[PDB]
Amino acid sequence: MTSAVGTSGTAITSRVHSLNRPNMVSVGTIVWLSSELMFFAGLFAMYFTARAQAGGAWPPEPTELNLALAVPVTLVLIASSFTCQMGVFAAERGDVFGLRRWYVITFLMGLFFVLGQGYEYIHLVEHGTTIPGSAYGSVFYLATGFHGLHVIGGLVAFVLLLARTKMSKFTPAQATAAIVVSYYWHFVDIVWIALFATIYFVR
Amino acid sequence: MSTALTHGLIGGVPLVLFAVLALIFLTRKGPHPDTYKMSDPWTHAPILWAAEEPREHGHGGHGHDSHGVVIGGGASGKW
Amino acid sequence: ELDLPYGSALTSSGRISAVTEPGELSVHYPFPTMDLVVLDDALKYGSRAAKARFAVYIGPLGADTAATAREILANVPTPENAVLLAVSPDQRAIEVVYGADVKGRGIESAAPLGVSAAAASFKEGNLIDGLISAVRVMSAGVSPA
Amino acid sequence: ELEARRPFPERMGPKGNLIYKLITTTDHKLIGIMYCVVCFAFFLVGGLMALFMRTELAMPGLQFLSNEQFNQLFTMHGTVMLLFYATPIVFGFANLVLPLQIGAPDVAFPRLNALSFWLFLFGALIAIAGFITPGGAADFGWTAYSPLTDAIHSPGAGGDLWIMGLAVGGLGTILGGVNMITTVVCMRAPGMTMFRMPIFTWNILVTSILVLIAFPILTAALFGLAADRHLGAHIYDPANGGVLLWQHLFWFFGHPEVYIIALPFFGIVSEIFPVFSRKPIFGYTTLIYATLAIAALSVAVWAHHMYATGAVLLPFFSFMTFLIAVPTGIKFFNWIGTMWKGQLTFETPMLFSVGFLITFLLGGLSGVLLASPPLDFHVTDSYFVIAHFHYVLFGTIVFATYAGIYFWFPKMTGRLLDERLGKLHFWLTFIGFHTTFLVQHWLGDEGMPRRYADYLPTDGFTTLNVISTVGAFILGVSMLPFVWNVFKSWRYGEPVTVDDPWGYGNSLEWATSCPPPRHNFTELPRIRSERPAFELHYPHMVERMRAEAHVG
Amino acid sequence: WSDALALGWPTGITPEAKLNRELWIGSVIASFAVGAIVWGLIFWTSAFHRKKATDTELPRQFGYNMPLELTLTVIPFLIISVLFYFTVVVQERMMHKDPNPEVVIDVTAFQWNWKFGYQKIAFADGSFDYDGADPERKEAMTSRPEGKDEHGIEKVGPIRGMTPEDRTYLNFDKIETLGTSSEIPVLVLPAGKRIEFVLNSADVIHGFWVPEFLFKRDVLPEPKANNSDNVFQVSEIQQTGAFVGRCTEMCGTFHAMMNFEVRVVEPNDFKAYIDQRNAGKTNAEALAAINQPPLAITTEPFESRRGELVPQ
Amino acid sequence: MSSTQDRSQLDPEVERHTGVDVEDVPSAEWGWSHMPIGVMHI
Amino acid sequence: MHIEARLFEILTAFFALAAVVYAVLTAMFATGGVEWAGTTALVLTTGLTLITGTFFRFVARRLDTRPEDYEDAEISDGAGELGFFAPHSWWPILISLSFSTAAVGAALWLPWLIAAGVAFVITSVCGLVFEYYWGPEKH
Ligand code: HEA
Ligand code: HEA
Ligand SMILES: CCCCCCCC/C=C\CCCCCCCC(=O)OC[C@H](COP(=O)(O)OCCN)OC(=O)CCCCCCCCCCCCCCC
Ligand SMILES: [Cu+2]
Ligand SMILES: [Cu+2]
Ligand SMILES: [Cu+2]
C-alpha cells in the first residue's frame, strides 16, 4: 500500500483510452439503441398494419388527436435533446456542475413531456378512445406508451447518473456515462419525432 | 400394431445397438500408457512428484532466493 | 538449447507453449489414472498432517544413490521441510531424504518404516502401490512442525 | 533439471470455491461454462419432451398423453430447444472462446454478459414453469400464431408465462449480442486486424447483428401479444392484419432466429476442419463474405415460412430463399476444400464435424425443396418440414456444438474427453438421428400434418412412426455416453499439460495454457495471418503458409 | 420407380396435383444428384487419412482457390435459377382464378371441425340452377347512439367501426355439410368439373389440406382483411372415390381430430345428391340414397375419450 | 490505502485437531466449521 | 475502424435495397398493396445498420489507425494501460431476478408484483451502476 499497485486516481476508469481508440461504452450503447430502433420498428409495423386495414377514416370518429397539446410536448422534447447536448458539452469538459445543471433541466423537461403525454392520455380515454375500445386507440397507446416507458427509463437514467456524479469525482469514465445517457435521450427524441410525424401529421 | 411388439422394439433396439457399439468402441485400447511392469526397465523420463501441500510464503517466485538444500536425513533400501 | 522435437515454441515471455498430435496425450505417465489419483491424494492430504512437503521420485538415481537423492530433493519447492522418497527400479534402489526443518518430528524414526513399506510392495510387484504405502506410513510418522 | 508436478492434477477443488464465483463471476470463461452446462440441461429437459411425444406417437391411440398435453410438449420442446438451448449456447460458445480467439482478456462489458446469462437462465425457467400450473405450459405451437394465442384461445396462465419468459430471455440474448459485437469492434489484439480474426469470431460478430436485428422485433411482438391478452388491445385482431401481422412480425424475427442458431456453429465447424485437416480453412476471405451475405439475406427472406397463407408476395421470397441457399452452398464447398488433400485424423471433434456435413446436407437439400412454394404447398406443415429443420438444426447445433464441446473441452477444463466414449457417443447419435428423422420425410410426404397428437390406425405410416420412436430412443441413450464422458473427464481423464491438445491449432486460443489464465493470456504472439497459433508452434511453416496459399 | 422416388407423395388426382408431383420429382432428382456428388466428395476426402508414410511434412496447405470458388458459386446459381423458373411456371397453375367455376364450395372451418356450404353450382354442359343463400350474414355493428358516457362518444366500433365479434366475413349456404365430432364431414364433389373452394375460418387459423390434392391452404379468420387469397380453384378431379383430408395448422387441442373427406362422385351422382339434399336429408342419407357409403371410409371419428387409460 | 490492517485475538476453546483443517475450510479456527459426515448421511 | 464501419455500411446498403424493392413489389403485385409490416421492419433494420455504421464511420474518421486495425502491428505497440473491466459482481443476478419478478407479474397479471419487480429492477440497476462509485462510509 506504498502508493498503489495500480497507478490510477479513480478506482473506475474508461474501458479504453478514448482519445486514440473507440469509446467502448459509446459503441455498446449505440449498438443497443440500434436494437431499440427495431423494437420500435415492431411497434410501427403494428400501427401501420392497423392503419392500412382501417376503412378510410383512420382515427375513428370518437378519437380526436389533441395536436394543440401534442405539439408543445414535442417541442419540449426537442428542447430537452438540445439541453442534453449542452450537458454533454459540459461533460466533455470537467464541468461537473454544468453537466448537473444541464441534465437536471433535461430531466425536468422530459418529466414535463411525460406528464403532458399522460394528460393527453386521460383526455383521450375520457373521450372514448381506449386500448380495448378501438384498434386505432390500442395501436396508438401501445406505440406512444412504450415510447413513454422509454422516456421514463431515460429519466431514471438521468437521475441515476446525477446521483453517480454526486458520489465520486468526475472522470472520463463518468463523462462517458453522461455521453451514453445523452445518446439514449437523443434516440428517444428521434423516435418521438418519427412517432409524431406518423401519428399526427401522416395520420 | 402389436402394442407389446412396438414397446419391446422401442425399448430394446436402442439397448441392443448401445451394447454393440460399446463392445466395438469401449473395448479398444486407450491412449493411456500401459502400467509399468517392474521386470521391464524404467524407460520413462525421470518423474518427480510433489504434494503442493503447504503455503509457500509468497506466491511470487522472486524473493524466494536459494536458502539451500539443508539436507536433514537419509535412508536406503534394496526392495 | 532446443525445444521439443515438434510443435513447441518459446513464447514472447519465458513460458514454452507446446503441442501434441490429436490422438496422443501429454503426461504419458506409465501408471493407471486411478492409482495416480490415489498417490496424488496421499501426497496431498495424507501429508497435511505432516505439514512437510512429501515428494516421490520414480526416475533413476545413479552413481552414489544417497547423493543423487540429496540433489533431487534440492529440486523440491521448499526442501527445508520436505520428504523425498526416490525409487529407481533400474537399480532396485530406494532412498529417502529429509529437510532440516523436518527432523526430530518422527521423520527419522519413520524412514525405515517407509522404506520397508515401499520395499515389500515393490518386491510384490507394485510400484505405485508401494509408493502410496510408503507415503502413508511416512506421513503418519511425521508430526506437524 | 526436472519439475515437481503433482502425480495427477486436482480433481475437483476445495469445498466452497465455486458457488460464490457463479453468483459473482465476471469471467467470460466461467460464464461460458455456465452457459454450456445450463444449456445442455435444457437440451436434456427439452429432449425428454420429445421422448414423451415419440412414445405417444409410436401407436395410433392416445396411450398416455392427452391432446393438450401433447400440444404443450412440442411448444415447449420447440421453445426450449431453440430459445433455451440453441440460441443461449451461441453466446455460451462466444463467451467461451471469442475473447480467446481475438486476444482479448475479457468481453467488452463483462458484468453485462453475466447479466445476459442470468437473464437467460431465469427467463428460461419462467417459460418452462408453465408446466407446474394446472392448465399446463403454452399449448399453442412454438411459432405461436396470432388468434390461437389471443386471450380467447389458450386463456391459461402457461401461455402468458411463455410470452414473458421469452421477453426476459430475449433481453439477455440482445445484451449478449452487444458484448460480442462491442468486444470484437473494440477489444482486439494489437496485431489482429478485422480480416485476420478467426472465422468463428467473424461468425459470432455477424450473428450478433442478426440477434440485434431480430430479437427486439420479437420482444415488440410479444408485448403486443401480451397487451392483446391482458388488455384486449386488438393488436392482432384478425379483422386487422393481425393473423398476417404476427406471422410477418414473428417470422421476420423467426428466420434470423434459425440463422443466429446456424452461423455460430458454422464457425465452430470451420474452426475444427483446418486444425484436423492440417491446412488453412479453404477460402477464408470467401467464408467471411458468405457469412455476411447469409445474414444480409436472412433478414429479407423471412416470409418463406408463410407460403401456405396465400397472403405474401410469393415470388419475391422464393427468389431470395433460392438466393440465400447459394452462400450456404459456398460455405459447404469451402469446408470440403479444407478437408481436401489434408492429413485428416478423425478424432471425436472431426467425427462430429463431418457428421454435421452429412446430416446438414440432406436437411439442406430438403430446404430448397421447401423454398419452392408449389412443393411447399403439399409438404408444408407436415412431418417433411419436421424432418427438414431437424436434419439442419440437429446437424448444425447438436453435431457441431458437440464438436465444439469435444474440440474445446481441454481449452476450458485442461482435461481431454475420452476418445472411445466420444466415438461411441457420435455413432449412437449419428445412427440414432438418421433413424428417427429420415423416415419422417416419407411420414409427412404422405398425409400426416405435424403437431398431431394422435392418428387413426386406418391411416397408413404406422410403421414409420415406431421407426421414428426407435431412432429417438437411440438418440435418448446417446446422451448417456456423453454425460458420462464429461462427468468422468472434468475431474479425471487424460490431463493436457500443453497448448493445442489437437496439434496444428489456429485462432490464437491455442497459444495459451489449456486452462487459460484469468485474463486469457500471459503471452500474446505476433499476429501475422489467420493462423497465429499455427504460425507460433510451427515457425518453419510460416513461409510455406504464404507460398502454397495462392495456388489453391 | 416413380412412386418410390416421390418419397411418399400421393399420386395426384387433379391436373394441378399431377403437375406439382412432376415438379417435385424433378426437384428431388436434382437434390439427390447434388447430394450424391457432395457425399461422394466427403467420402472421397475421407480417403485422405493421415497415412503413416506421411513424414515430417505437412499437407499442401493451399486454401484460397479463386477460380474453383467462382465455378462452384456460379453453378449453384444456375441450378437454383432453373429450379426457380420451373417453380414459377408451376406456381402459375396454383390458382388460375377461372371466373367460371363449375362448382363453388364454401369451406368454413371452425374450432375442431369443418362445414361445407355449396355456395354455387354451374355446370358447363348446362345444369344446376343452384345458388348460395346469404340471408344469415348479419353484421354486429356496435353503433349505439351513446355508450357509458352521457354524450359525445357515440362509439361506432373498434375495428373499421365494427366489433371483433362480427362474423360477417363468414358466408352461409342452404346445403351445409356440417361435421360433428362423432361424424366426419364428407364434402361430395362432382368428378371432372372445376371446383372452387372459398376458404374461411370461424374462430382461428387452421389449414385445409387434401393430401391427394397435393395442395393446402390456410383458412384464416378474415382473409380479405388480412390480404389473404383464401379462395382457390382446382381445374378437375379425375379419379373418383373417397379421399381423406386433414387439418394442417394449429387449431387448439383437437387439432388432430379435424379430419374430413372429399368424396368425388360422378356428375349424375352429384345431381342426385344435391337434389336429395335440397329435399330434407342429411349428408349420410344422401350418400346412402346415391348408393355410396355414408360415413367417411378413409377415416373415422375416433374416440372423444381423452385417451386409452381414461376410465371411460 | 485508507484502511488499517486488522488483527484480532479470539478466545479459543475440541482443539480443531481431529476434523476440518484450514486448507479445506480457511476459517476453521474462527468458528464451528465441520459437521460429522455421519450426521449428514443419517 | 474502417472495416468495422464498412461491414455495417454494406449491411445498410443491402437492407435499403431490400426495403425499397419489397415496398415497390408489394405496393404493386400484392393482394392489398404495401404489406406495411415487412416494409417497416426492413426500413428500420436498414435504420439499425445505418445508425451503427454511421457511428462507426464517424469514429473511424475521428481515430488514427489503431494497432488492432493496423496490419503489421507489433504486440508492444498495443501494450499499455487497458481500461477498467469490472471484476466479480453479484448485481447482475439481482437485476435478472428483479426483471424476472416484473416479468412474472406481467404474465400473471398482478399489478402489485409488477410494481414490486420494477422497484427491485430500479434498485438492482442502481446497485450495479453505483457499484464502482460508492465512496467510503463517512461515519
Ligand atoms: C439451423 C436452422 C436452419 C437452417 C440453416 C435453414 C436453412 C434453410 N431453410 Fe429453414 N427452417 C428452419 C431452420 C433452418 N432452416 C426451421 C427451424 C423452420 C421451421 C419450420 C416451420 O415452422 O415452418 C424452417 C422452415 C423452413 C421453411 C418453411 C417450411 C414450411 O413451413 O412449409 C422453408 C421453405 O419453405 C425453409 C427453407 C430453408 C432454406 C431454403 C435453407 C437454406 O438456406 C440452407 C439449407 C439448404 C441447402 C440446399 C444447403 C446446401 C447447399 C449446397 C450443398 C449447395 C449446392 C446445393 C444446391 C444449390 C441445392 N426453412
Ligand atoms: C434445437 C432444436 C431442436 C432439437 C435438438 C430437436 C430434437 C428432437 N426433436 Fe424436435 N422440434 C424442434 C426443434 C428441435 N427438435 C422444433 C423447433 C419443432 C417444431 C415445433 C412446433 O412446430 O411447434 C420440433 C418438432 C418436433 C416434432 C413434431 C411435434 C409435433 O408436431 O407433434 C417431433 C416429433 O417427434 C420432434 C422430435 C424430436 C426428437 C425425437 C429430437 C431428438 O434429436 C432429441 C434428443 C433427445 C434427448 C437428448 C432426450 C434424451 C435425454 C433424456 C431422456 C434424459 C433426461 C434427463 C433430464 C430431463 C434431467 N421434434
Ligand atoms: C409487459 C407489460 C404488459 C403487456 C404489454 C403492455 C404494453 C403497454 C405499454 C404502455 C401503455 C401505457 C398507456 C396506458 C394508458 C392508455 C389508456 C388506456 O389504456 O385505456 C384505459 C384502459 C382501460 O380501458 P377500459 O377497461 O375499457 O375502460 C375505459 C374507461 N372508460 O386501461 C388499460 O387497460 C391500460 C393498462 C395497461 C398497463 C400496462 C403497464 C405495463 C408495465 C409493465 C412493466 C414492465 C414489464 C416487463 C415484462 C418483462
Ligand atoms: Cu427460414
Ligand atoms: Cu388443424
Ligand atoms: Cu381448425
D3 within domain boundaries? no
**Minimal C-alpha gap between E245 and chain G (Å):** 27
Q: What are phi and psi of B60, to 5 degrees?
A: -60, 140
Cell digits for E212? Answer: 391427394
Q: Which amino acid is at E23?
A: L
CA distance E235 to E214: 13
Cell digits for E190? Answer: 362432382
**CA triple D529-D533-D538, angle to 5 deg:** 95
| Cβ-based neighbour number of residue E136 at 10 Å | 10
| Cβ-based neighbour number of residue D497 at 10 Å | 17
CB distance G50 to ligand 3 below 6 Å: no
Question: If residue D318 lies in a helix (H) or strand (E), which one and from where to where?
Answer: helix D314-323
CA distance D421 to D419: 6
Q: Given CA atoms D496, D499, D505, D508 in this order, what sign does their dihedral have?
A: positive
Contacts by E290-293 with C-beta closer than 8 Å and gap 24+? E290/E265, E292/E263, E292/E265, E293/E242
- Of D257, D224, D227, D295, nearest to A45 by C-alpha is D224
C4 — alpha (psi -120 to 50), left (phi > 0) or beta? beta
Residues in B closer than 8 angstroms to D424, CB to CB, are 21-22, 24-26
Inform me whether the C-beta atom of residue E125 falls under 8 Å from chain A C-beta atoms. no
**Domain extents in chain C:** 1-145
Residues in F closer than 8 angstroms to A1, CB to CB, are 1, 3
Q: Are D292 and D263 in contact (CB under 8 A)?
A: no
Chains A and B touch (3+ CB pairs under 8 A): no
Classified as helix, coil or strand, C11 is coil
Q: What is the DSSP letter of D302?
A: G
Q: Given CA atoms D407, D409, D414, D418 in this order, what sign does their dihedral have?
A: negative
Cβ separation D552–E65 shorter than 8 A = yes
Please report, for chain B, how many H helices and E strands are present, in that order: 1, 1
Superfamily name with CATH number, domain A24-200 = Cytochrome c oxidase, subunit III, four-helix bundle (1.20.120.80)
CB distance D432 to ligand 2 below 6 Å: no
In chain G, % helix, strand, coil (3-state, to 5) comes to 65, 0, 35
D7 within domain boundaries? no
Which residues, at least 6 apart from G35, have a Cβ–Cβ distance to it below 8 Å? Answer: D248, D312, D313, E227, G22, G26
Cell digits for D524? Answer: 500474446
Residues in E closer than 8 angstroms to G30, CB to CB, are 227
Q: Which ligand is nearest to the CA of E216?
A: 1
Resolution reading in Å: 3.2
Cβ separation C25–B32 shorter than 8 A = yes
Q: What is the DSSP letter of G135?
A: P
3-state SS string over A129-184?
Answer: CCCCCCHHHHHHHHHHHHHHHHHHHHHHHHHHHHHHHHHCCCCHHHHHHHHHHHHH
**Exposed e or buried b for every residue in D101-130, given b needs 16+ CB within 10 A?**
bbbbbbbbbbbbbbbbbbbbbbbbbbbbbb
Calculate the alpha carbon distances from D457 to C22, D279, D441, E243, E256 in Å. Answer: 52, 55, 19, 16, 13
CB distance A130 to ligand 3 below 6 Å: yes
Q: Are D137 and D130 in contact (CB under 8 A)?
A: yes
Question: In chain G, how many domains are there?
Answer: 1
Nearest CA in chain G to E223: G31
Which residues, at least 6 apart from D88, have a Cβ–Cβ distance to it below 8 Å? Answer: D35, D38, D39, D42, D117, D120, D124, D169, D172, D173
CA distance G121 to G100: 9
D213 within domain boundaries? yes
3-state SS string over chain E?
Answer: CHHHHCCCCCCCCCHHHHHHHHHHHHHHHHHHHHHHHHHHHHHHHCCCECCCCCCCCCCCCCCCCHHHHHHHHHHHHHHHHHHHHHHHHHHHCCCCCCCCCCEEEEEEEECCEEEECCCEEEECCCEEEECCCCCCCCCCCCCCCCCCCCCCCCCCCCECCECCCCCCCCCCCCCCCCCECCECCEEEEECCCCEEEEEEECCCCEEEEEHHHCEEEEECCCCCCCCCCCCEEECCCCCCEEEEEEECCCCCHHHCCCCEEEEEECHHHHHHHHHHHHCCCCHHHHHHHCCCCCCCCCCCCCCCCCCCCCCC
Q: Are D509 and D537 in contact (CB under 8 A)?
A: no
Q: For strand C9-10 and strand C16-17, is the pairing parallel, antiparallel, or unpaired?
A: antiparallel
Q: Given CA atoms D126, D132, D138, D141 in this order, what sign does their dihedral have?
A: positive
Q: Are D117 and D172 in contact (CB under 8 A)?
A: yes
CA distance E301 to E113: 11
- Of D40, D86, D450, nearest to D259 by C-alpha is D86
Technique employed here was cryo-EM
Mutate to test the interface with G, among A13, A16, A18, A21 (most CBs of G within 10 A): A21
Helices (H), D446-528: 462-490
Question: If residue G112 lies in a helix (H) or strand (E), which one and from where to where?
Answer: helix G111-130
Question: In chain D, how many domains are there?
Answer: 1
Q: Which chains touch C (3 or more CB pairs under 8 A)?
A: B, D, F
**Alpha carbon of D73 to ligand 2 centroid (Å):** 9
**Minimal C-alpha gap between E185 and chain D (Å):** 16
Q: What's the CA dihedral at E290, E291, E296, E301 to 10 degrees?
A: 100
Which residues, at least 6 apart from C105, have a Cβ–Cβ distance to it below 8 Å? Answer: C50, C52, C142, C143, C144, C145
**Structural domain harbouring G131:** 1-139
Residues in F closer than 8 angstroms to A3, CB to CB, are 1
CA distance D54 to G126: 48
Inform me whether the C-beta atom of residue A36 falls under 8 Å from chain D C-beta atoms. yes
Q: What are phi and psi of E64, to 5 degrees?
A: 60, 65
Chain mean position to CA A45: 20
What residues pack around ion ligand 4 (CB closer than 5 A)? D 255
Task: Scan for cell 419540449, then name that residue.
Answer: A76
Nearest CA in chain E to D382: E248
- Of A81, A63, A84, A150, nearest to A114 by C-alpha is A150
Residue D350: give its domain's CATH number.
1.20.210.10
D2 within domain boundaries? no
Q: Which amino acid is at G1?
A: M
CA distance D174 to B3: 48
Q: Which chains touch B (3 or more CB pairs under 8 A)?
A: C, D
Inform me whether the C-beta atom of residue A40 falls under 8 Å from chain G C-beta atoms. yes
**Alpha carbon of A11 to ligand 1 centroid (Å):** 51
Task: Scan for cell 501441500, then name that residue.
Answer: B53
Cβ separation D122–G88 shorter than 8 A = no
Nearest CA in chain D to G89: D24
